[PDB]
Amino acid sequence: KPHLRHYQVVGRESPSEKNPEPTVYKFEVFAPNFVVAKSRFWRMMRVKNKVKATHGDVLSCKVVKDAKLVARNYLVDIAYYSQRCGYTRMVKEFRDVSKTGAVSQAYHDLASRHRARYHNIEVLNVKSIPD
């Protein structure tokens, strides 16, 4: 029912004719599809690694399984962009069931109050909170 599943996308940089064994990059992104995961996989590597989607290959994107469906806390360090105060990060600790669920509320909250939508939004540290 909550959209925006959680994808585990990993990939080298088409090895290599120069380096012959480029370091593998893996990161987990929330996305509606996996085409949208790879689209934002090759945005981190184009920026945080200077690697094109052309000059590299996706090793194994994957759908993370779940957590036993039970309520718990979540602080989601989220970073959006807007003409509304360009590139501000946030914390916005939510209380939903799964990481997919809470990050959904994260997006539907920023697009609600900052009108920042999916591609203007990076995510980091979707972790939980005991108390």
Place this chain on the structure above:
RNA sequence: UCGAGUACGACCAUACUUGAGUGAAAACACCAUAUCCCGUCCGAUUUGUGAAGUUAAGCACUCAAGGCUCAGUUAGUACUGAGGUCAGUGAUGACUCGGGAACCCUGAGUGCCGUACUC
């Protein structure tokens, strides 16, 4: 006698130009001279003609800097082709699908080869 030595060169600064060092054989080099062609207002320049001589310059070899060449950045940045019944503002701004710099700075090193001769 072996690397290089001259003179011919091809790439044309990694080769340039700087302060020096370096020159062991030859070989260039300055060098002697107006005794001739020579044209020098000049024996400077060059152009007759040879070896008392000299590494003083020149020249190649060494290090060791601007500059130059290769790269690491700079930077997936700027910029850009394409696409939005994108967002505001008629300021470009992000996004998506791509291309993708430069100056700089930290580097690397600071020529290479090709024909004849001569040893």
